[PDB]
Amino acid sequence: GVVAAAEKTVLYVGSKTKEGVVHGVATVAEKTKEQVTNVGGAVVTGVTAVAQKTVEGAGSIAAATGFVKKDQLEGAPQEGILED
Amino acid sequence: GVVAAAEKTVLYVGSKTKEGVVHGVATVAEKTKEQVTNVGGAVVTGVTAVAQKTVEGAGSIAAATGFVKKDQLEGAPQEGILED
Amino acid sequence: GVVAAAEKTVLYVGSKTKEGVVHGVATVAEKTKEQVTNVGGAVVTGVTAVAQKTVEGAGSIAAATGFVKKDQLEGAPQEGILED
Amino acid sequence: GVVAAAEKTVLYVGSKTKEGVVHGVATVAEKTKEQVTNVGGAVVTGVTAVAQKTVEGAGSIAAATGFVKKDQLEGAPQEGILED
Amino acid sequence: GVVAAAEKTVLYVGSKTKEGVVHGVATVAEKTKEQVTNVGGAVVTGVTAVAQKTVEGAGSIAAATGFVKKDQLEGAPQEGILED
Amino acid sequence: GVVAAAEKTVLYVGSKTKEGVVHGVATVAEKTKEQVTNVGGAVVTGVTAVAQKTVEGAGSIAAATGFVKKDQLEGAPQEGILED
Amino acid sequence: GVVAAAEKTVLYVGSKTKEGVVHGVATVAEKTKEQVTNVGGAVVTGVTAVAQKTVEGAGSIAAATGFVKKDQLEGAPQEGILED
Amino acid sequence: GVVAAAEKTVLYVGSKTKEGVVHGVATVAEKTKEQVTNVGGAVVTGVTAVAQKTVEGAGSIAAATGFVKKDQLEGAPQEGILED
Amino acid sequence: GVVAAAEKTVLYVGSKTKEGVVHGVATVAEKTKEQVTNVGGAVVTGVTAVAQKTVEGAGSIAAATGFVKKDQLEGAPQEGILED
Amino acid sequence: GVVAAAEKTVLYVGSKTKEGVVHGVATVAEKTKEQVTNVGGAVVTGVTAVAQKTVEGAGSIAAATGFVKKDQLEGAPQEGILED
């Protein structure tokens, strides 16, 4: 793996790794408006400076699935009515 | 793995790793408005400076699933009525 | 694993690892408004400077599931009526 | 594991690890308003500077599930009526 | 495990680990307003500077579940009426 | 000056002023080193969250003058010798 | 000056002023080192959350003057010798 | 000056001024080193979140003057010798 | 000046001014090194989030003057010798 | 001046001014090195988020003058010798 060896008989020996890293982030937001309206699904908004490492599995960042329907032998409606 | 060895008979030996890390983050938010309205699902908003490491499983950050329906042998409605 | 060895017969030997870490975060929020209204699901908002490590399981940060319905042999409604 | 050895016959030997850590966080919030209204689900808001390590289980931070319904052989309604 | 050994025949040998730790946090909140209204679920707000380690179980911080309903062979309503 | 008047025959009348004010300050300092060496002058360091108001005089914050020499009818030496 | 008057024949009349004020300050310092060495002058360090008001004079915060020498009809030496 | 008047026969009347003010400041400093060496002058470093108001005088923040020499009818040396 | 008047026989009347103001500042500094060496002058470094108002005088922020010499009827040397 | 008037017999009347103001600033600095060496003059470095208003005088931010010499009826040397 990540090994460092020196055999003396100034000196520098080094091994370094980086996986899933986020450095310096600077952000300014002044006059922001955000509306979210959902009825029967999934919504993901506003994800900033996120890091991850997964070894023996599934890695997911900002993932949205509306719905999972695995039935066996009723429906699944959604109704976003808006009027004026 | 991450090993460091020196054999003397200035010296520097080093091994270093980084997995799932977030450094310096600077954020300013002045006049922000946020509305969230949901009826039958999932919503994730505003995730900042998050880190993770998972070894023998599934890693997920900011994940939204509306609903899971695994029945066996009724429905699942949602109604977001808005009027004026 | 993470090992450090030196054999003498200035010297520096070092091994260091970092997994799931968040460093210096500076945040200013001045005039912020937030509205949340949900009826039958899940909502996650405002997650900042979070770190985790999981070894033999599932790691999840800011995860939302609307509902799980695993029946066997009624419905599940939601009604967000708003008027003016 | 994390081992450090030196064999003498200035010297420095060191091994150090970090898992699930949060460093210096500075936060200012001046004039913030927050409204939360839920009827039949789950809501998580405002999570800051949180760290965790789990070894033989599931680790979750800021997780919301609306409801779990595993029946066997009625419904589950929710009604957020608002008027003006 | 975490071991440190030295064999003499200035010297420094050290091994140190950190799991689930939160360092220096500075927070100022001046004029904050917060409203929470729930009828039949779960709400978690305002979690700051929290650390945990779990070995043979499930670790969860700021987790909300609306309700668990595992019946066997009525309903579960919720009604947040607001008017003006 | 700052006056407020109301003449009735909900009401709000208000006059407010702010001069030399410092609001919410959050600061974290983790591993800081500072060396100061002076021989014949003035040094000012590390001034944070300071406010002042002066009306009929001179206002000064973090002011350094090396020396004032107003003689009338010897010298003024300084010697910062450093060696290795 | 600061006056408030109301003439009735809910009501609110108010006049308020602020001069030289410091609000909420939160500070964390973990591992800090500071060295100061002076021989013949002035040093000011580490001034935090200080307020003042002066009306008919000179206001000064964290002010350093090395020395004042107003003679009339010897010298003023300084010697910071450091060796190794 | 700053006046507010209302003449009734919801209402809001307001006058407000701000002079020399500093709002929310968030700062993180992790591994900082600072060396200062002066022999015969003035040094000012590290000034943060400072406010002032002066009316009939001179206002100065972080001002450095090496020296003032107003003689009338000897010298003023400085010697920063450094060697290796 | 700053006046607000309303004559009733929802209403909002307002007058507001801002002079010399600094709002939300977020700063992160991780691994910073700073060396200062002066012999016979003035040095100003590191000035952040500073505000001022002066009415009948001279306003100066982060001002450096090496020296003032107004003699009347000796010299003023400086010697920064560095060797290796 | 800044006046606001309304004559009733929703309404909004407003007058607002801003002079010498700095809003939201976000800054990250990770690995910065700075050397300053002066012998007989003036140096100003690192000035951030500074505001000022001056009415009947001279306003100056980050101003450097090497030296003022107004004599009347010796010299002023400077010697920055560096060798290797």
Numbering used by the authors:
A (entry chain J), B (entry chain H), C (entry chain F), D (entry chain D), E (entry chain B), F (entry chain C), ...: 14 to 22, 37 to 100, 105 to 115
Question: What did the original publication write about this model?
Answer:
α-syn is a 140-amino-acid protein mainly expressed in the presynaptic termini of neurons and plays a significant role in the trafficking of synaptic vesicles and the secretion of neurotransmitters. With abnormal conformational changes, α-syn can further self-assemble into β-sheet-rich oligomeric and fibrillar interspaced structures. Here, we find that a recently established α-syn fibril strain, “B”, markedly prompts the co-aggregation of tau protein in both neuronal cells and in vitro settings.
After helical reconstruction of the main fibril species using Relion 3.1, we obtained a 3D density map of the strain B fibril with an overall resolution of 2.61 Å. The helical twist between α-syn subunits is −179.47° and the helical rise is 2.408 Å. Notably, unlike the previously determined WT fibrils, the N-terminal and C-terminal regions of strain B fibrils are adsorbed onto and extend the fibril core. Compared to other reported polymorphs of α-synuclein fibrils, the structure of strain B possesses a common, conserved β-arch fibril core and has an identical fibril zipper interface formed by residues 50 to 57 (50HGVATVAE57) from the preNAC region.
